Point group: C3
Chain length 498, copies 3
């Protein structure tokens, strides 16, 4: 509303990075929408990367992140404090590294890889592997690795320490002048972060949780204009344990709060903790009004709200596709019951050998879908392409896309395919495509068991390229008028203004 | 006899310390008696403590140790030699510690606890925890602890070294000027002391045994006026392996030489080794003439003698106690068959709910006596108070004390209670209270099985406060005239003079 | 032929050393023969010893190695290169060792054994054990050993590094001026040599195999006059993987290519790899024309040749031996079926108690032959003397020697005994004594099962000292005229000239 509002939204996820999607791409778009309504919506991360500036720069150039959206990082905050406490490069650090490397001889392995040996004792001193903009230096003691200095543009940003099993047990972070501002213990057995020492402020913290809580109380002004939104479930404790009294906290659950493949009536451990404590924050936000009603009818909480996702209606291809191409662009995870779909490919091709499948994306169950299509020799017909950073250009050469799951928040990947004139085929599930797919109108829906009824539907479409177009043009105009943005945006503000 | 005798007794136990009793308190009193007869009786210990001066000072101020009694310590002997080899403080040591601490930043944990990090590399350097008179400094390498310097009044007395599992594998002891005089290897797996290097005399020793044998040959003049008395069974090898030809050696066995809870006819492993070699020293000393006769009738040894213990007849309360208070002040050990007594409390209270129990002292089987009285909910009635440094003031508010065992040397803890006008109740056993308890005269004795006959006897006393007094006044006057000191003292001298 | 031929033979075995025999003694003699025919035949080794000069010097003085025969060593090659790159002693190395030893105090253990402790901290610094011409210095860190410097004539030739389990994980070799020329990683778990760094030439090598291949291409001129002969089966990959195009390669198999105690028809793993690749080198050389025919009738290889061994007909004793002395001078290994011979001693002595046995040499199954003759109490009669560096002087006091095996190349140890007027007794086997023992003529042969038929034959000889002499004099004159050297030598040259 107000073009000069002091409202601001801090969206919290553990890490940002390139070549993902789903929850993050939803966060990127949500930031874009809020910025349009003159409300700054930025992102807060809590992990360390020495090249986040290069990653954020990439995410914006590659058109995945609105350029107005900033990422706040806990380590970038304390680094910048450190930067303004010193006004002289930390040469003693580079002298420390230089001194351990002198009186050594060099022996090359390959192009930018060399080892160094003391010319007096013959002792193994260092291993240096340098690219062109980054460099690592591994120091050795008693022929075991003890330390690694990491470089970016000839500058140290991290020092790692290694135990007896050659695993990290300690990290140090150096500012842009070479001064250490943060160091922390690492449990080598699981990689969990322990005690964290903020050297620049001479303060210690029990763990990363205690550090980021302290960080948010510094980053986020305790005003009712400050709004915290936690997408990732692994960041919720950070938002919940702050001593904010005025600031708002909204937990956004993205997934089904039901345990995967459990008929007990049990929930996800983390996704339930959020729900239980809904009456202590400003309310948990789901996506379907169904999932609201389920949580209503399970937990004693008077504070759940349903808000869908902003959709970006990009532009459909100039044409369609004629050749019997079916695709499944997704990340391979057992929760999607892909086992209960590739046994529809098999059920299709035998009635029509010209139907082809292009599988994109990666995952854990990729390598056993791989060693499964050749057991049946559908390598002939089915292809596991790979991860595509161009989801739409791979989408615009489909006749239709296919997907399934037993657990979803809603339809993200199915919706954005319907825009590109593509009639997707999926099951009816708990929370998802019971609303944006109208069966025998612009797409198809099947009970999540009748595995050849889906195999029946595909042949009603791929063999009818003139009917696999009207269903596509009735897809896009279906998305557009159904949820919009204003309907969704006013959901958010009325929650804010209260 | 002779007020100017050159006779001296060295009583040997591994360690002395505060808040114990039994064998040690017997040693403290025996020293007091011998000093009265103009024969110096001192104590020799073989362990290391940096605060033994403070402990001995406490033992005397707190009236547990005769002030004339000295403690000789093997490490205090070599420290004092070291003290007179140097006449200039070892500043290079404190410089060595200072240098490793400079260029560091401090980060506090609590009041006197801080960690230190190198301001150039961010490396974890040191952990310092200081009280007000003592201080520890833990140094780190590759984020693992390697060394600990221990301070007392700002002075180093010990440096410890740690292995990969963070356990001690090496110790160093510094004199009062900061010079190392003794270092030794420690087996981290069991804490056993290995090779011991006497740096001040440039001599090495296989273990602590070889070190203390050498020490006794220095400490104790090889004359017939020198008398060695080994109370602790764990110190006997130290006395036995010396090359003394004239000096006397007397091993004093305090306990039953029968294996605990074994009906085989087997003995304690250590207590038998002493017995087997009785014909090689000046004789083993037991406490009961019974235990003498048993050893006579088991081993071929013509050299066993029976001598009881000196009793200190202190002063009884001004009054008694009326309220049904029963106490067991003892150290909780399975050899005392406490299981076979707390199931007499149960057998008592049900006939008289006003009988109360106060349990003092500590032990291993305290925590399962604890979770046992509440299973039966005698928390109502039975109390595990705690260790009492005031045994008599806790004793002087009893009507009677109670105890049992299947194995004893004699009655120490039962005897000193009879002084304070208290009729104790105990079983008849191998070696013990068959002599200082006269049943139905001043106390009570039961077969060590009839667990409710004891429960019968208590009610014959606690419900008769006028009969639980005559039995008390017949207790003290019973101890006094029965064994005395002169009868016991002349036992010792006639052994000496031979 | 040509007294000025540029032909040269490099005989390759992994290591040479004192107190062995068999394959090596065969190599020593073969070098001697070839040198007589004006063809230099030298030996190449691939292991490290700091005292090989002293060992080779011993092998020649003790008359086991022809003085014209040289040993080439891969580490001696790179050391000599290193020697000529520096013209100033590496004092900084000895300064490095001196500095770590100053400010220490000495504590002796025995004659030439002492430990050193820092006089400031008391820290365990070093352990030095010196003989009179060699010395080791073990340095310690956190009371664990980390390094060992090895000395010969006050000069460092090796530095070893130790891991957490106190095992070698790194080696460094110093030239005769104290400069490191080679360092290498050691797998502590098995002692296998990994990455090898040639510091003097700044080159790295995957392992010892890659190092010695490179070494042979430097050592051995790629000419048809250069001839490589690989005796040891463990050195064959080194000869086979060189990029020699003109040089000749001859693999000499010494043993049975049949798996020990396997009736499957399976071969030795290594000895087969040689055979399989016979068509890629200049031919594999066996010893018996039988073993040739077997390999012919198993593998598809058109390139196997049979050449026997050069025999050194030394000089027989002035006399014989009368006293019933039977000997088995050998190295104790289960492949010799000694179990199937000592149960003929037993079968002999019972018919003649005066027959005695002298067993020389060592082995793995010595200690259970030991605890076997006393179970039967033939200690009376059978003796395990020990390893004899004087094989012939121990041979010249026998009436006859005895041996057996199920696997041999031929008869080495049986043949050289026949020279000294001794009728040996052995079984007929695969590849061996079916040719140099003529039964009931100068010796005896039995089927390798009839264990008392051999026991029958001995008594036909030891009880007939006038018949145990003619068989001896028919032994020596049997060896002499049968194979000679010229017959064997021309076998070699005709292989060379082709
Ligand atoms: C915002 C939201 O509701 N998220 C849902 C989503 O999370 P999740 O993050 O797993 O999103 P999905 O994997 O279901 O959707 C596919 C996503 O992967 C991206 N992609 C995939 C392959 C590829 O080659 N390139 C590419 O970019 C797509 O842009 C798309 O955004 O699925 C979960 C279950 O699986 C649901 O419970 C969550 O509710
Ligand atoms: C000198 C002697 O003969 N020692 C006997 C004693 O050794 P032990 O040293 O175990 O002596 P006991 O535990 O039997 O006697 C109790 C001792 O503990 C002290 N105490 C206990 C609790 C408390 O709160 N405060 C306190 O000071 C008492 O002063 C008393 O001296 O018991 C052994 C078996 O158990 C016997 O075989 C030994 O023969
Ligand atoms: C060149 C050759 O064909 N070598 C054969 C030999 O190798 P190997 O090297 O094992 O030779 P053997 O052990 O069979 O012969 C005994 C050797 O050991 C030496 N010795 C033994 C004891 C002693 O006290 N002093 C002493 O010097 C002898 O000099 C003799 O040379 O036996 C293998 C099986 O066992 C055969 O397959 C090999 O073919
Ligand atoms: Cl900002
Ligand atoms: Cl500055
Ligand atoms: Cl004194
Ligand atoms: Cl001095
Ligand atoms: Cl040469
Ligand atoms: Cl030089």
């Amino acid at each position: 509303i107000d073009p000069f509002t002091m409202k601001k939204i801090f969206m919290m996820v553990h890490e940002l990075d390139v070549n993902k999607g789903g929850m993050t791409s939803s966060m990127f778009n949500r930031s874009k929408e809020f910025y349009d309504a003159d409300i700054p919506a930025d992102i807060v991360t809590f992990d360390y990367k020495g090249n986040y500036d290069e990653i954020i720069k990439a995410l914006k150039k590659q058109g995945k992140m609105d350029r107005r959206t900033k990422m706040y990082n806990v380590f970038e905050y304390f680094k910048q404090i450190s930067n303004n406490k010193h006004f002289k490069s930390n040469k003693l650090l580079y002298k420390h590294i230089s001194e351990r490397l002198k009186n050594t001889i060099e022996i090359e392995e390959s192009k930018g890889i060399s080892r160094y040996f003391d010319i007096t004792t013959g002792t193994y001193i260092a291993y240096i592997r340098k690219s062109k903009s980054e460099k690592v230096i591994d120091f050795f003691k008693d022929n075991k690795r003890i330390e690694r200095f990491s470089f970016i543009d000839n500058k140290v940003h991290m020092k790692e320490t290694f135990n007896v099993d050659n695993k990290v047990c300690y990290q140090v972070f150096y500012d842009e002048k070479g001064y250490p501002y943060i160091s922390r213990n690492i449990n080598a057995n699981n990689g969990a972060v322990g005690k964290t020492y903020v050297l620049v402020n001479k303060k210690e913290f029990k763990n990363n949780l205690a550090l980021c809580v302290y960080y948010l109380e510094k980053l986020i002004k305790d005003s009712k204009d400050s709004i915290m939104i936690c997408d990732g479930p692994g960041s919720f404790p950070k938002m919940f344990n702050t001593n904010h009294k005025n600031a708002q906290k909204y937990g956004v659950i993205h997934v089904n709060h039901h345990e995967n493949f459990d008929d007990t009536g049990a929930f996800k451990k983390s996704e339930k903790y959020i729900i239980e404590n809904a009456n202590k924050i400003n309310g948990v936000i789901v996506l379907t009004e169904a999932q609201r009603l389920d949580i209503l009818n399970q937990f004693d909480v008077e504070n759940i709200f349903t808000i869908s996702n902003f959709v970006k209606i990009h532009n459909a291809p100039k044409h369609f596709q004629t050749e019997k191409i079916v695709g499944h662009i997704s990340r391979m995870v057992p929760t999607k019951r892909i086992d209960l779909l590739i046994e529809v490919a098999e059920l299709v091709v035998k009635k029509d050998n010209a139907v082809k499948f292009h599988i994109y994306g990666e995952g854990s169950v990729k390598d056993k879908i791989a060693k499964m299509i050749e057991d049946k020799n559908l390598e002939r017909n089915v292809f596991l392409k790979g991860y595509t950073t161009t989801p739409q250009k791979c989408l615009e050469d489909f006749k239709l896309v296919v997907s399934t799951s037993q657990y979803e928040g809603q339809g993200l990947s199915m919706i954005e395919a319907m825009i590109s004139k593509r009639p997707v085929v999926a099951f009816d599930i708990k929370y998802g495509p019971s609303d944006f797919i109208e069966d025998n109108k612009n797409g198809y829906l099947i009970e999540n068991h009748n595995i050849n009824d889906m195999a029946d539907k595909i042949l009603q479409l791929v063999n009818n390229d003139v009917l696999a177009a009207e269903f596509g043009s009735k897809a896009r105009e279906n998305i557009i008028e159904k949820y919009s943005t204003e309907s969704i945006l006013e959901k958010w503000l009325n929650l804010f203004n209260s």
